[model samples]
Target: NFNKETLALHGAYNFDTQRSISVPIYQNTAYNFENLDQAAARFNLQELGNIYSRLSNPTSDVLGQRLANVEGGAFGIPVASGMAACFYALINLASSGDNVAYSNKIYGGTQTLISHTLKNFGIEAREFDIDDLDSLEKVIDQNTKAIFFESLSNPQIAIADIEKINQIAKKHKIVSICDNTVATPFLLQPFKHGVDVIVHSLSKYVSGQGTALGGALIERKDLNDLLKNNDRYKAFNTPDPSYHGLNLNTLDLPIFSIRVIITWLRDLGASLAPQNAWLLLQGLETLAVRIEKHSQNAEKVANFLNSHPDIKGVNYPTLASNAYHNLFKKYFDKNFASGLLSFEAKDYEHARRICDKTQLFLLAANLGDSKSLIIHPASTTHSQLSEEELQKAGITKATIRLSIGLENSDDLIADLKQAIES
Candidate 1:
């Protein structure tokens, strides 16, 4: 088998009638079936071809399968957005009465999705300290369906103990879902340490250019055995009329990925578009090189900010004094900790000034772009949190989050240096 970089360039797509070198966008919404008998077979899940774009598309399918293969997964389902990917992971496993455990140090939108939006559907969100993950089990019980956390925690840039977290989830017989968007598969692949499922917001590092907004839910090569006879995941074990009477657990297929594609996409209609998938495919071609430079550049940024007196504290796992440095070394490569880092400013206004004064660092809430990004968490991404909540999440009024990009490290550091001094 070829390596990930080679696989990304030529993995899932085959030449069509035109025999084009690139994947052709099957941009059409619907596909015509040969006969009613074949149509019935497609609808019954007896055959695998696109009936409609909502279910699947040729262009998107190539991107999905390629990402799954790159992630060392059995299968993948691309969704509308990253939040939708996180939504599917929990919603697919938990019902109204069930709850899930997640790290407190995650994207603010995700925290809001789990602690707020999902609550509307009666699914509970249990917050656990990412640093003290041993407390994770105490918060989980029989009613817990899944454990969710980021591979590299957002904004704060903390690293999760993947193997330990997976062990806890395994011990409880619950699924563990890792949002691997920040780290991307190039930096860290969660499946390597036994994570059951991985979710990604392709908008970030995966898409590389920030051109398309997308998400993916991928299952490990052998996740089917995890759900067999497990009472917590009856959705897969029990037969239902959701699509067909086919019980997912009995298929000997990647049940989690199949369920997300068939049931979640069909009912929720959070399907990804063919055009966006095509954009993401272009990004995948150079994803490895981009991530490597991103990591190398970020290390320098962290060191510069750490020594600057204007900074109260800097949180990037690769930093020697950083709290998560050991975990970073334990789980990641020599110097690749992704391009996300955060620092505490003097106060709220100080953070705002730094954000606005920077020349290269654009004032934006989004991350994982080719151009650098900066935002004050108190006023932007984590604005919804209360004072106490913000403190618990390691956010202060002066906290400035940076999404370092592919720019020269010297330029990035100089931009920050002048901005802080200004």
Candidate 2:
């Protein structure tokens, strides 16, 4: 019903109805049911209305709808955190004994969630090289439920071949989920390249200020047909016991989002608060402009570090020197390589020294902030991983990851110069 820009501003909000210019925060624990019949209708899955804040809130629903619209997806569900989004996204499709084939190049937290945490819950995490589509196919079997990869991987800054990956997933009738956190929809829209779902850490670029922790899962409209007919996803094809025997697909509703809300959000209770949703809405308003500056600053910083003598290697897709440059060009356009870039120092000692020496760039584990931030991934974000796992994710003691901000390019370069030189 709206274009991407307008949708971000007003897709799920109407000023005329509320008589408020900004979306009103319905900050309440529960909504009142008109009567016993109405309440019964709501509980019986025959009607759609907010019953509890733990499941749905007006403010958060707006954020989800706007995000889905902007991402070119049919529907979206906002959750408590990015990790919650990732967990719910996979758990909704995959159950015990099922497996999800993932691109090994991902955030350390995600790697842990898939590899260890989910494994405990009996969901196998099969990892394959981000560049190796053939290996991805080899890992898939009867129990495989979905294929996942970061649109642009964290720390590593590696770009996945979205089209080829999605094609393979489609051929196998598996859902393709992309964590489009780093490469926000401004830089890349995964759905446009045939990805079935998009997940984001609203804590990062979508929030743009690192002020709130939220996450979202967006589903392509066309996925309903795939889920309904596919025997592998018996969860969607059959009735949901918790939801009073209602089959989401047969209801002619948004099957993916509906299942997530009625089941995962309702029972698991990883709900995004109204306040956090409002904060994310404010960030979403300026996402395009901020990402443009972030990308510009990142390109400058990547160029600077790639040429530095102290730097052994740099990871940024726009740089022609990177191994993923062609894939970046194939999937993403120029002038928008996102805000993250990484470089390798001489060793762990040198990496620590540079991190400590940065004057303008703050030493923090977070990314997508207004101010530039730097982190030593080996000792911080990816610290939980052993040496072998670190190597698989392209993390080393010498690696330094930067979340480029809106600061002047020259100042950022100077800050890095002093840090690296000292």
Candidate 3:
């Protein structure tokens, strides 16, 4: 009912009990139950209340609900870190013998998690070019459970065709999960384009100040309908022998979201801390404003780099000449290209030297901070990648990634100018 700016600040909290303006962090480990009957009711899923912190918390619940509201989703589950979000999100849907198809133009950590780590668990990770939609379904088979890709892929700064990808997923009855970390909900909501689930690295732009380490998985409220009676999702329709013949689909709730908390979060246990959730909530209060400034600043920085003689190419969606510019135009309702971009330098040494030479832009791997950052992805963030994989991710020894911040654009340009020329 309210604009995103309004929702981001005041979306999912009630101040009825204590009349506290700031959402209180329920930092305790366990909640008091009325009796054994109440406890049993909670454990049996007959009543939805917090039994343990690992499964849920009041502070994290508000954070989750706020995130879901911003993304226009049915529910949300917050995790310890972004990697945890990706891990739990996929593992909940796919098993040992299943396969997952992901975008090749993705974070190196994610690529390794899917291609190498998941492989150890007997799951096959198929890489597909997001731009090449035709090749997407080719990698999918009867065993494929879910398809995941970034809304705006990191390092490469490429945008995916969400609608087409969702159509392909719909055709196969596969769950489509998008990593909306870079674009965030302010710039784009993948759920609006028929994506069933969204994963996020709350440490990134969501926190804005980079003070929190967390992530989230959100599912649409209507996802229960899509999943119920679906042959591929037999786990939902079938009863868990332990939970007293309880079926996730039979519950009047968002099936995938609740199942993740009951199973993955219950057993694996990577719950977001109450303190970190509080920080993320604070960040969300100003998310819309911060994102606009980030976009405007990044556009300035990208234009400066794009016109530079030493820079071969600038990979930012807002750049009119960039490969994903049209896709950005087609997908986003605003001019938000986010604050991340990369450029092809003269060579590996040149890239590294420029990265270290910048005085204002910190030479670090983390992105989406109040202060600007620069990184040589081939050496730092994407170092685990093989030569072939690096090439596929649109990363090279000469590629230098920059996470533009809320700093003065003129100062940022001057820092880059000196770094490049020096």
Candidate 4:
């Protein structure tokens, strides 16, 4: 087990050329082929070399490798954003007529993907409450290919039971997936609990400075074959005319990312910018330290909110009395809990004033930044969902979400006190 700081700074980038101490971005759009044979080999997937920035980039590769290492994944690929990773993962596993089961509690964008976009392709996004195994069991049939949910739900702050969920998935012989973006590998590694795949929005804790937008998916090699549409995921297993009779999902482990790059990213033109990749690299070098601070600050804020009169309630995994406290003790490491928590205000009007009056907290939606951030989930992220949907997912109309940052806890508490009182 490497120290967190050591893993973040030096896990991926190794320089054998002139022993350069720093990782340099290979900012080229295309790489020169040595010969026709080499190009053919690369094109046929027999050679391991860079051919185009769309498929692979040096800066992004370094960030991916470092992130996978820190998260204990076999390999990882950096993509355009969190949604690209989310969409690509399911596309690799399911096609028309196939189905996926997910926890209802998730980020808003993911909910939109499962609830609407996937349905347009004849795919079903079956939802279940994280606490209800029976609800999950009813959704899995022969056509069910993947199970997706957060290790720790956003805004709701529920700690999922990854081990039990994996057991259920193993019974059905399907890939069990977890979006570890909220729990970050510092808090938990889904793979350790038998989860076959992991996804992350690198825009969050992985790029702790919140300067870049990227996403990643990492899966175990044995199950990489199921990522394509075939008898299992027949979409990519069959010859894809889009890429001239290529069966991409059957490619070697981690190569699945390349297929996503060629098929989805290439056509969609959602590739991450070279400059964004560079910014992600800068963040990766300090991931471990930033996570520690983020987690520490979050716990402090949750504790403060516990006794506050302005807060009607608070949900944070670090709170021993919260519903998911046992799950937290089982899966999370010391000094790590979900870095963000949500609580309802005394009234809807108070929610507005808190954001309007706060000084230390920024009223912004982005999380995992060095600066404290806050938002009202009901009026913002989940405003479109029905009131019943909001309640089932544990979001309330007065809910205020906080992404505690690396600032003086006393100052943050003081600001909250004054703002809530005002």
Candidate 5:
């Protein structure tokens, strides 16, 4: 096994076959099978190889495998979008009649997807407070398939108590899924804390530049055996009729990875394209360096905002005064708090004006770009939520979210100073 840094650059790609230093984009839609028997074997899961771009592509597979390696997982599946990754991860385990428990503190898009969209398909999303373990235990019923939460929540910048949550999920014999997008594997490896699955918006920090959109779901190898023994995950242990009655457990592979690739990706059709996967691969090559710089720049900015008279408060776990600082220290590496932070302004108008007036910071909804970005969550990303929902997510009209970039600390602080003053 390679170190994390080496794995990011060389874990999954084989250069000897093509003599190509960079990962080649397998842009074509189909791969040629050797013969009818080979094609039949590939389709029937008797042999494993790329059959169609919709199911898997060589370029994307590199990204997936590299990510799984970086995150200490057995396998990874790439999807078209972060939303698709989250949806596929949940649906892969829970079907129409099943339910999943989620933390109330999460990305607004994810909240809507779970609380509303999944409900339309007869799947229920039961929300529990991240701070309240009792509430989490109460929400998980017999039909609960997984306990999902963000490792570092968006906008609000709350740090999850991963150990506590993992214990609850284990006690209930449910899978634990964590969205580690904001925290990135560079900062935190969720699997180390007993998380069963790790999901990421490769479009964000993993992509680093926000140039392409993609997502990934990584499964711990041990989870396959855990679910195999658990009676709740009949889907994995039982026969899958769609794949010629093949049981995922019987396959000599990661159960979650195979099921998601064959069952979810095949049926849902949210495959990540090769070109996008290539772009993300480039981003991954420098992820460790970029994340360190991002954390350094964000820490300076967070400290500056914390002391600013115009700022009511700053939400960054690295701040010694922050409530989640301990949790951050316990879960994250090297005291890195990631690039995301939030601050409160005087009012809605002031927050909007600050966002609009920033010269260096772009007023955009996207996060984890190489360039700095700022957004008003209550009016944009979290606008879909009702008043109570917004409050639950720790969002208000006065809240300003910042995705700091690799910029000069003084320059970023100066930009904020001007924006707030104006």
Candidate 6:
């Protein structure tokens, strides 16, 4: 029985450093081997240590352990950003001829990755309306490697029915991957509801400040066996030309982390800086308190928008008026919903005006800061996506996504009211 407050402070890396309270910053990029035999053994995955920064780093290891603990997974792999976490997870299961389906309501980057980038590699990325279980069912075939989605989608605030989706995935024996970025572990843990793999863009609430750009991948124990047996996951079980035939699945259940670090992070080389890891570590110390306040303030803001005529409509699962509200309560724990909400305006220009005029809320793309944040989806994050794609994501020209933070509710509400009404 872990409370949010206790989890944040003491969840991971509560190691007692000799004469120091803060987690130490290990700034080294490389580690020394005792001898040639030791080096060869380490290279063979017989022992784990920092041989190279791209493979692993001590600073990131601490953060990863902390995150895995919070998420209730056996282990975690910290990545350069949230999208990288998703990319590594998908690519782990995807090969040139594999296919995966995603929720249409996912973040824009996901759609683009599926439709454009990964598609060229012969990895088919398809979209289905998550609410329509039949649609998801139709997309699954023998080639379907994984089913990817966000636990709570970006900009749209639609809470996924992880239980239903997981059941479908279990039936198919495919990986059920979710970007639990918005909800975080504080609001929801997808694995508890039968999700197979969970990823996060730690740039949000886990960092608790907007200063870090990082992400994580976590999974239940024995995930290595799943990867080993799945034909699509040959990259994990088989030897690579890159690492001289190191079998990742034989390493441990942290094999997912090992595979991503030893392969993708090694070649792609998107290692998170030690400073960013340290900053996120500091942020983790206060994550629970900040998230509690963030959700409470967001609820108040969502209620305000729900009642305001100028706002047209608001989408927040915690609101009793929400069509998904009952499902939200059933799936989520006592923290309620997160600090994310979206509402419609009279027009695109009205949405732009509200974003530009709000004094308390910053017109920025980042969220999970101590300040309120707002953005117009059509004009910002989802701008490059086609109109058809935007509609599929449940975003519109009039949609205004608000990531309410730790600011006083009255002041945040006052600024939004004046901005929308004006």
Model 6 lDDT per residue over 1-422, tens place: 77545655665555555735677787878878889988988777777666887777877878887777777778888889988888888887788898999988888776788778997788888778988889999988888888999888887888788889988988877888989988888778787877778988888888877889998888876666667766656667676677776666666446766767777788887788787888887787787667788889999998988888887888999888887897788878774688888999999889988888999899898877788888888877888898777877778889998889788899999999899998
Better of 3 and 4 by lDDT: 3
Q: What digit string (tens of lDDT, one per residue) describes model 4 on residues 191-234?
A: 87888778889898777766888988876545564454435556
- How close is every model to the real structure, measured as TM-score? 0.98, 0.97, 0.98, 0.93, 0.98, 0.94
Question: What's the CA error at residue 198 for candidate 4, in Å?
Answer: 1.0
Considering only N, C-alpha and C atoms within 3 Å, which residue pairs clash in candidate 1?
none
Candidate lDDT values, in order:
0.88, 0.89, 0.90, 0.81, 0.90, 0.81
Q: What is the C-alpha RMSD, rounded to one decimal, of candidate 2?
A: 1.3
Candidate 5 minimal-lDDT segment of 10 residues? 9-18
Error of 5 at 238 (Å): 2.0
Candidate 1, RMSD to the unseen true structure: 1.2
Score residue 104 of candidate 6 by CA lDDT. Answer: 86
TM-score of 1: 0.98
**Model 3, poorest ten-residue lDDT window?**
7-16
**What C-alpha lDDT, on a 0 to 100 scale, does residue 263 get in candidate 4?**
67
Candidate 5 lDDT tens digits, 1-422: 56898899886776857698988888889988889999998888889997999999999999999899999888999999999999999998898899999999999899999999999889999999998888998988889998989999998888889999989888889999999999899889899989999999999998899799999999987787777857898998887677667777776778888888887888889999999999999999999999999999999999888998988988999899998988887888778989999999989889988988999999988999999999998878998999998898888889999999988889999999999988
lDDT of 1: 0.88
Clashing pairs in model 6, backbone N/Cα/C closer than 3 A = none
Query: Per lDDT, what order, best first?
Result: 5, 3, 2, 1, 6, 4
Give the runs in model 3 whose Cα sits over 4 Å from its true position. none
Q: List CA RMSD, all candidates.
A: 1.2, 1.3, 1.0, 2.2, 1.0, 2.0
Estimate the TM-score for candidate 2: 0.97
